[PDB]
Amino acid sequence: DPIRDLLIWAIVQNRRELAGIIWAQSQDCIAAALACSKILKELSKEEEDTDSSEEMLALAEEYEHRAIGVFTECYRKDEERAQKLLTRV
Amino acid sequence: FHSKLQKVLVEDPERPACAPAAPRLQMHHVAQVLRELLGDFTQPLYPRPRHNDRLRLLLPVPHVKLNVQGVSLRSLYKRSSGHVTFTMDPIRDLLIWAIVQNRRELAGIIWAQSQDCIAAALACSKILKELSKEEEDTDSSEEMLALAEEYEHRAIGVFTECYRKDEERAQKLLTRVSEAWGKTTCLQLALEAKDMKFVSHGGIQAFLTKVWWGQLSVDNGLWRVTLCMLAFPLLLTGLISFREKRLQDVGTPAARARAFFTAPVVVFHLNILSYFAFLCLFAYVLMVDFQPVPSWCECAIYLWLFSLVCEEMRQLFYDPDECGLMKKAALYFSDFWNKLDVGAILLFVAGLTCRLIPATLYPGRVILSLDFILFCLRLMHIFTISKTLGPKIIIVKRMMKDVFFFLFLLAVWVVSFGVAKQAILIHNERRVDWLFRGAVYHSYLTIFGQIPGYIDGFPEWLTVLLLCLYLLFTNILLLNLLIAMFNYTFQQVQEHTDQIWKFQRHDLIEEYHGRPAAPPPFILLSHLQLFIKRVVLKTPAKRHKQLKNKLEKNEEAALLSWEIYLKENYLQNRQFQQKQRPEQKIED
Amino acid sequence: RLIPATLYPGRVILSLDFILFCLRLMHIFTISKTLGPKIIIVKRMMKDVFFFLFLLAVWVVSFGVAKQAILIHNERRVDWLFRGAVYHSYLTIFGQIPGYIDGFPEWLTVLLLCLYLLFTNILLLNLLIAMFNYTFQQVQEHTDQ
Numbered sequence: 108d109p110i111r112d113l114l115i116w117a118i119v120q121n122r123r124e125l126a127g128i129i130w131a132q133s134q135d136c137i138a139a140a141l142a143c144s145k146i147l148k149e150l151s152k153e154e155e156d157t158d159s160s161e162e163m164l165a166l167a168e169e170y171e172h173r174a175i176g177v178f179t180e181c182y183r184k185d186e187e188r189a190q191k192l193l194t195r196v
Numbered sequence: 197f198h199s200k201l202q203k204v205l206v207e208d209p210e211r212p213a214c215a216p217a218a219p220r221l222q223m224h225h226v227a228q229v230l231r232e233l234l235g236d237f238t239q240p241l242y243p244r245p246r247h248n249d250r251l252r253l254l255l256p257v258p259h260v261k262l263n264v265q266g267v268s269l270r271s272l273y274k275r276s277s278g279h280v281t282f283t284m285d286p287i288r289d290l291l292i293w294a295i296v297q298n299r300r301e302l303a304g305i306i307w308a309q310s311q312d313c314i315a316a317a318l319a320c321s322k323i324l325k326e327l328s329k330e331e332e333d334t335d336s337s338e339e340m341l342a343l344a345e346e347y348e349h350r351a352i353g354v355f356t357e358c359y360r361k362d363e364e365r366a367q368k369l370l371t372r373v374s375e376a377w378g379k380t381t382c383l384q385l386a387l388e389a390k391d392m393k394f395v396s397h398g399g400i401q402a403f404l405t406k407v408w409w410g411q412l413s414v415d416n417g418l419w420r421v422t423l424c425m426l427a428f429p430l431l432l433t434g435l436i437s438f439r440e441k442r443l444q445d446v447g448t449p450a451a452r453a454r455a456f457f458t459a460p461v462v463v464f465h466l467n468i469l470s471y472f473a474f475l476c477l478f479a480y481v482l483m484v485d486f487q488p489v490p491s492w493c494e495c496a497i498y499l500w501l502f503s504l505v506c507e508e509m510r511q512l513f514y515d516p517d518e519c520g521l522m523k524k525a526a527l528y529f530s531d532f533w534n535k536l537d538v539g540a541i542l543l544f545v546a547g548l549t550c551r552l553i554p555a556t557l558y559p560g561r562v563i564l565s566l567d568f569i570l571f572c573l574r575l576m577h578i579f580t581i582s583k584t585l586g587p588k589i590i591i592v593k594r595m596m597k598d599v600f601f602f603l604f605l606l607a608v609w610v611v612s613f614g615v616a617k618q619a620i621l622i623h624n625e626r627r628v629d630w631l632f633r634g635a636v637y638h639s640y641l642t643i644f645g646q647i648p649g650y651i652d653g654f655p656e657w658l659t660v661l662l663l664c665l666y667l668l669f670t671n672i673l674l675l676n677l678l679i680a681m682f683n684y685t686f687q688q689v690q691e692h693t694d695q696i697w698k699f700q701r702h703d704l705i706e707e708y709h710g711r712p713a714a715p716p717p718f719i720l721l722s723h724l725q726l727f728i729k730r731v732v733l734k735t736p737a738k739r740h741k742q743l744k745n746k747l748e749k750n751e752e753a754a755l756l757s758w759e760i761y762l763k764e765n766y767l768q769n770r771q772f773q774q775k776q777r778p779e780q781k782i783e784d
Numbered sequence: 785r786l787i788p789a790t791l792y793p794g795r796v797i798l799s800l801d802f803i804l805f806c807l808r809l810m811h812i813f814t815i816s817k818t819l820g821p822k823i824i825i826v827k828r829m830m831k832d833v834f835f836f837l838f839l840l841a842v843w844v845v846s847f848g849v850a851k852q853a854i855l856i857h858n859e860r861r862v863d864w865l866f867r868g869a870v871y872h873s874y875l876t877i878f879g880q881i882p883g884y885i886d887g888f889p890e891w892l893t894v895l896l897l898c899l900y901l902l903f904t905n906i907l908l909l910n911l912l913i914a915m916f917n918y919t920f921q922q923v924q925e926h927t928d929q
């Protein structure tokens with residue numbers, strides 16, 4: 108599938124628009140955002156050390172905001188399948 | 197600034213030139229008004245003597261026929277000394293003129309076309325912070341401090357854009373001498389500007405990390421360098437390898453030893469070793485060798501004590517300049533640590549003299565024992581190395597410097613303990629008071645709480661209940677002061693104690709780096725090389741150990757054009773951000 | 785203990801291992817609703833002051849040596865057998881100086897021993913509140929995370 112790997116390609120490249128633009132049509136709604144957040148936080152903790160680390164940490168925790176938003180709207184509806192969602196393989 | 201100019205013009209005028217006080221505006225007056233705002237910098241563009249003679253150019257002087265006074269090139273005089281078209285460069289001095297005058301626009305307007313991109317901003321920041329700390333005291337000090345730290349923001353911005361491109365020349369940038377700014381390697385001037393954010397901009401971390409390790413690359417751990425240095429042939433085994441071994445530069449074990457010993461980190465752990473070893477040796481020689489005659493252990497402890505005296509000796513001559521020996525050395529030694537440095541030697545000398553005096557044969561040992569506590573202070577004074585304990589050690593340094601007067605408050609207040617408890621019995625001012633108990637001085641307390649009741653076999657308990665309650669009150673009035681003074685600088689320190697850490701690290705290393713690589717066991721070679729060489733010269737002229745480099749003309753121009761180009765890149769980006777904040781939107 | 789040289793010291797050595805298990809005692813007790821988050825807080829603070837631990841321990845080494853500077857050391861002597869200086873068990877100087885054999889200057893340096901203890905409260909107890917007071921905001925609601 109293209110989108111799952113294109114998010115991986117775009118996230119390590121550190122932009123605003125492209126990541127969300129690609130995600131807007133992601134088949135895997137929840138796990139891709141979590142994977143992008145993890146990769147991006149690791150890149151934060153590796154090495155930039157000035158002028159970018161805090162901004163792209165804010166972008167990471169924005170991906171956590173957005174994962175919380177999608178989990179909110181999937182807990183709006185269909186609670187049963189909502190809890191079985193949390194074992195996505 | 198204008199008041200300072202009037203003062204400097206009235207400090208060194210002459211009588212006949214102009215009546216009230218106005219002989220001329222020369223390099224002298226600007227030179228002093230700068231030297232009161234700087235340290236060891238250079239005097240610009242015309243020293244006094246014959247090669248660049250500006251001595252008597254305030255009265256008529258003899259003409260060419262003597263060829264010794266004036267210009268000695270033109271035989272005509274036109275009531276003027278001439279006109280040099282370009283002094284050195286206009287912008288560097290026009291920033292200096294504008295900054296002391298306290299405006300927003302003009303300083304940046306002039307800087308936008310500065311040839312010297314980085315050093316001029318640092319110099320302006322330093323001068324402006326000194327003017328802040330001198331005297332305005334209301335309505336301006338904080339605003340122009342904000343302007344100063346804005347110049348630090350802007351220096352960080354230009355350093356950002358020069359670390360965007362050409363990393364190699366970017367790190368070699370940080371030794372900018374310019375041959376016109378009082379070189380300062382572009383860092384001594386920077387560190388004199390006190391660098392709130394400047395000393396933590398990434399590239400400077402790489403810089404101070406690669407200069408902290410001389411001939412010592414990556415893949416070395418804090419726990420693993422101790423094994424490398426302690427186990428001496430072990431470095432040649434399959435342990436951590438260096439670029440010398442990687443490039444096969446280790447052709448001789450002697451070469452390996454020379455490369456290792458000259459590493460800066462080696463001398464630090466060496467003085468960590470030798471100082472505690474000398475403390476243990478002092479204990480050993482006090483403990484057994486209580487012989488006034490010079491014995492083996494007596495001379496052994498004399499050796500390293502004399503070596504430490506020689507090191508503090510050398511630091512004391514290096515402290516002042518070539519002319520003022522007493523003044524600035526005493527100014528630096530007015531600090532409590534340096535005063536204790538003097539005291540550690542003076543008390544030892546006094547104790548030795550007292551011990552040689554038959555009156556105090558026995559008290560001499562007790563007096564000499566007290567000097568060890570001073571060395572205990574150096575123990576945690578020098579231990580600014582640990583990654584997590586080190587910043588806390590800077591914190592304890594500053595807090596004890598702050599509560600240096602709470603120390604005396606506590607000590608003087610306690611004087612009302614022994615006197616208050618001893619008010620029951622009659623004093624002995626001209627009596628047999630001394631010999632076994634009297635009241636104060638040093639050793640035989642048996643009232644530690646162990647009152648000697650062994651001879652024994654509504655009212656009376658509560659004032660001695662209130663002795664311990666008054667101790668609880670001591671916890672009230674005094675332990676409160678500790679947390680109180682700590683809780684004034686309690687915010688965002690965990691992340692911004694790194695700035696203070698790096699700053700005292702560099703301040704310490706700037707003068708502690710000029711220490712020989714020869715270990716104390718092998719200090720006799722350096723002694724025979726330099727200490728007997730001293731006497732033939734009035735002033736020691738050894739090569740000064742610094743990280744500065746001499747710049748050639750072609751590399752100077754090739755760099756300077758590059759900083760100018762990246763400065764243009766920074767300026768256009770700057771405009772892009774000045775579009776962004778909503779203030780421009782609202783006035784638009 | 786099986787070695788005949790340390791038949792008796794083996795029991796003393798084995799007794800020390802119990803303190804390590806004492807650590808697991810409060811390491812595993814992360815269950816209580818209100819004490820549990822505070823136990824995570826104590827876990828992180830002790831992990832942080834793991835080096836203050838060694839600072840405090842090494843600094844104290846200047847207590848017994850400083851008090852014992854009056855008398856001559858015994859490095860190759862009969863030093864051990866009943867008192868010598870350091871290791872484990874027979875302290876009778878808990879403040880109970882054995883004066884039972886007994887029957888302007890001299891009080892204040894041993895006044896300053898307790899004053900120096902107050903100074904220990906100065907240099908060191910400050911570190912506790914100091915390191916705690918760096919993560920002191922909005923924890924009560926965000927220590928749940």
Ligand SMILES: [Ca+2]
Binds near residue numbers: 530531532533534
């Ligand atoms: Ca001092």
